[PDB]
Amino acid sequence: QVLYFNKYIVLDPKGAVLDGVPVEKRQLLTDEEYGGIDARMGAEAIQELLKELDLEKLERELLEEMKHPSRARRAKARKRLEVVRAFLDSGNRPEWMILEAVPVLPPDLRPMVQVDGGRFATS
Amino acid sequence: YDGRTGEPFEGPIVVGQMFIMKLYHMVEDKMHARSTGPYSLITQQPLG
């Protein structure tokens, strides 16, 4: 929500991490909560984010927090896979979730018919 | 008597003057049929 709108900057890369506190390869940092960027904002963020994101490793970083957990928030743990494995043994890549292409449906489907003369009715 | 056959009905029949009426509905305004015709342009099908 704050990773595009409301500014708020995301912390993507790289870049050795702690400015007034570490800051754990993950995120955000507040607008006037200085630092800089070397990350960005907007979706580019979440884009180059997804891409550079080990696929299978999480089948392990989740298949290790599945047998030695608490059972309170180590419940959603599993759920991560359900999307994960859902992307893997599927043939569908993430990234694309952010659109580098915003298509246009056909005309004969989102009509522009003539009403009673010159004033029309778009779909 | 059944006008068709001279023989009358075989059971007295209750008869009399009954007040009736004609209602709003009259087939004349219902009833239709279309083999083909006006194809909409919006949805792409028969209308109007």
Residues of B in contact with A113 (CB under 8 A): 41-42
3-class SS at A121?
strand
- Residue whose tokens read 């995120």: A27
Residue A47 vs residues A4, A10, A84, B14: alpha-carbon distances, Å: 12, 11, 16, 90
- Gyration radius from chain B CA atoms: 24
Structure obtained using: X-ray
Given CB atoms, is A109 within the 8 Å cutoff of chain B? no
Residues of A in contact with B41 (CB under 8 A): 111, 113
> To the nearest whole angstrom, how far is the Cα of B30 from the nearest Cα of chain A?
28
3-class SS at A6?
strand
* Gap between the Cα atoms of B26 and B30, Å rounded: 7
Residues 6+ apart with CB under 8 A from A80: A58, A62
Residue A15 vs residues A3, A23, A60, A119, B23: alpha-carbon distances, Å: 19, 11, 25, 58, 86
> Whose CA is closest to A36, among A61, A60, A56, A17?
A17
> To the nearest whole angstrom, how far is the Cα of A16 from the nearest Cα of chain B?
58
3-class SS at B35?
coil
Cα nearest neighbour of B40 on chain A: A113
Q: How many CB atoms lie within 10 A of CB A38?
A: 12
Given CB atoms, is B43 within the 8 Å cutoff of chain A? no
Cα nearest neighbour of B42 on chain A: A111
> Whose CA is closest to A110, among B40, B45, B42, B44?
B42
Interface test with A, best of B39, B40, B41 (most A CBs within 10 A): B41
Q: Provide the token pair at A90.
A: 């599927």
Give me the phi and psi of B24, to 5 degrees please. Answer: -45, -50
Q: How many CB atoms lie within 10 A of CB A119?
A: 7
3-class SS at A4?
strand
Class of residue B30 by CB neighbours under 10 A (exposed 0-12, middle 13-18, buried 19+): exposed
Q: How many CB atoms lie within 10 A of CB A59?
A: 15
A&B contacts, CB < 8 Å: 4
Answer yes or no: are the C-beta atoms of A34 and A19 closer than 8 Å: yes
Q: Provide the token pair at A78.
A: 């599993």
